[PDB]
Design a protein around this ligand. Structure first.
Ligand SMILES: Nc1nc(=O)c2cc3nc(NCCN4CCCCC4)[nH]c3cc2[nH]1
Ligand SMILES: Nc1nc(=O)c2cc3nc(NCCN4CCCCC4)[nH]c3cc2[nH]1
Ligand SMILES: [Cl-]
Ligand SMILES: [Cl-]
Ligand SMILES: [Zn+2]
Ligand SMILES: [Zn+2]
Lengths: 368, 368
């Protein structure tokens, strides 16, 4: 198996479908990555994550470096062995989470020091991801807060680009990592076209295996996110994967694919599952609602998941009302399966040249 | 398949091993029943409960009548369909739980009224268990508090015996229930030999499919519980199953089998699993302890369960420390599997006439 090979099998407008081949497996694109921040996709065994159709999951440098620790995970045989997931794992670099979750931060050209006292930098981030045994390593960046003035966005993006080069160099210096893993760069520039262009130029000059659109899904809303994607995605190399970080709701995913995105991750299906929200083709439902107390239908009428084959809305309603762990388990498995089925329909429709019609049909029903 | 047929295949001293055949499946005895109070064995899919080796699970009249409701479960197709467990279910009658969990109770010859305002009586308890579709129905009784004076124990036991007859009559009046389910009586009498005898006599005169030893595991401790079992179990009909309610720790189970008990239920493996206690052949361990943070061994070195085949102590330690649902799932599956393996070893050793040696070996190692 190759270290990293991206093939585009079909296109429709800006949308693409294909595969990334890696040593630990094949990733079908457009891809959705379930989030496994604490070395677990919450409430699911890895075998169940795979059963839903997931090809790859997301982990986090920031969380794992704090608990259980990067050196510790390496001593225990690496993240794959530790959590029992043998397929590809993409790890975020800490760039976002250090600023989102830390009680106090000190930012400088060297990197970021923070209180959980720890340090992250391009070099340390890449080293941690090496110790974890990540398959797709993210460059260490800064997710510019929204909104930002053009000047603040510019200085932030420029620092990220210097950090991108340091990330590239650190990754390339570690022979085993360079041989077995892939490195993605992260575009910044807030909502500004000229900065997005400068960022894309800088990343392409360095050269990466894939390119993430960073700095979005940070409160700007779908209209603005789509506006920025409209000009930002075409700036990235066409022949490499495009990864939209932290997106999103089903309609966000469809629109982002229409704009050239190949990869997604989001806590929504897992988190909202635990909170009682189930995704269906007719839009989300809250299973806690009294209207479901005697509803014998599955969560979704078409869904092929094991939950929908076996249990009723009424039962899951009871479980979630009761605070039962099995409620969280079943809701989560269903939601992750729903997300994977969405990605499968997207892939199939692009392959068949009917993605535009799929997007239209999807929205008409989902938002009816 | 028969409604109810108990066969004893082998004996050693007071210990027996055999099978109960019922319409929904065979129960190997001595049997351990995982507890499923809220219509779920906490943190496990029914398929996982079955995978551990369980033949039958326990449900509760008291909890289910309050949430989601007995009529509601019947409208939804019965408890088996509702929760997705198609094998036998034994339901406790509410006799214990109404007094243990209710905020206020009023006790009379008719039954018990309580605040969650509801009513339980022999007739209502049997009706609820009918609506649930229970396979083994428990008589509605009173679990005498411990300690009790001989006179208080006597009056309590006598009321339970009158309630046992009312339970028998209510069950027999419902043709579908009498055709498809079994009814067990519950012996009371606290710690007093003469009262236990009077209770056994009363139950045998009425006639039941099985006989539970009630009124124990209520704070008396193992020495006293065993002392009472020594004289109480031989009073019950030899040719019917003997069920010790609410027991217990592994050593309690072994000693109770040595005293003629065929059936057990306890929340210990599930509850203590969630709390970080794992059962092993060398005694329980608390997986949260720092000593496990880098321990690559499975929870137990011999255990055949899926958890022990795949994950380390170190990983489970991390999960439980982090409050992750998967931690609860894995600990629970392992503990329930451990309990089932204990029952299998008990069954095999009695079958082979080496149970005494097994009990000795078990204790020497478990308590080393
Ligand atoms: N290294 C790095 N750089 C980014 O610019 C970035 C940008 C991101 N934007 C998000 N948004 C997450 C949105 N999420 C939606 C569901 C509820 C929780 C928040 N996650 C991100 C992660 C990111 N990681
Ligand atoms: N109907 C009925 N009658 C009883 O005499 C009875 C006696 C019981 N004794 C227990 N003890 C439960 C012990 N358990 C150990 C693990 C922690 C929680 C308490 N459960 C019982 C249930 C019972 N149910
Ligand atoms: Cl997210
Ligand atoms: Cl118990
Ligand atoms: Zn489903
Ligand atoms: Zn095990």
């Amino acid at each position: 198996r190759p270290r990293f090979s991206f093939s585009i099998a079909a296109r429709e407008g800006k949308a693409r479908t294909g595969t990334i081949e890696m040593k630990r497996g094949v990733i079908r694109t457009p891809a959705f990555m379930p989030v496994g921040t604490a070395a677990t996709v919450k409430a699911l065994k890895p075998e169940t994550v795979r059963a839903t159709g997931a090809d790859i999951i997301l982990g986090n440098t920031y969380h794992l470096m704090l608990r259980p620790g990067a050196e510790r995970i390496a001593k225990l045989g690496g993240l794959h062995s530790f959590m029992g997931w043998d397929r590809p794992i993409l790890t975020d670099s800490g760039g976002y989470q250090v600023m989102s979750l830390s009680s106090l931060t000190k930012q400088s050209e060297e990197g970021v020091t923070f209180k959980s006292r720890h340090m992250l930098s391009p070099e340390r981030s890449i080293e941690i991801q090496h110790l974890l045994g990540s398959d797709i390593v993210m460059a260490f960046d800064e997710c510019t807060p929204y909104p930002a003035t053009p000047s603040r966005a510019a200085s932030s993006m420029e620092r990220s680009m210097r950090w991108a080069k340091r990330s590239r160099d650190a990754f390339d210096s570690r022979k085993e990592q360079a041989e077995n893993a892939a490195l993605f760069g992260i575009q910044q520039g807030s909502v500004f076209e000229n900065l997005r262009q400068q960022s894309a130029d800088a990343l392409a000059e360095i050269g990466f295996d894939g390119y993430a659109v960073g700095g979005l899904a940070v409160g700007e809303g779908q209209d603005e996110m789509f506006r920025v994607l409209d000009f930002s995605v075409p700036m990235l190399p066409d022949d490499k994967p495009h990864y939209l970080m932290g997106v999103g709701k089903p309609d966000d995913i469809v629109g982002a694919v229409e704009r050239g995105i190949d990869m997604f991750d989001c806590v929504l299906p897992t988190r909202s599952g635990r909170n009682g929200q189930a995704f269906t083709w007719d839009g989300p439902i809250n299973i806690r609602n009294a209207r479901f107390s005697e509803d014998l239908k599955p969560l979704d009428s078409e869904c092929h998941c094991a939950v929908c084959q076996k249990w009723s809305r009424a039962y899951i309603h009871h479980l979630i009302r009761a605070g039962e762990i099995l409620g969280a388990m079943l809701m989560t498995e269903h939601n992750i399966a729903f997300y994977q089925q969405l990605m499968q329909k997207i892939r199939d429709s692009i392959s068949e040249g009917r993605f535009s019609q799929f997007a239209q049909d999807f929205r008409a029903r989902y938002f009816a």
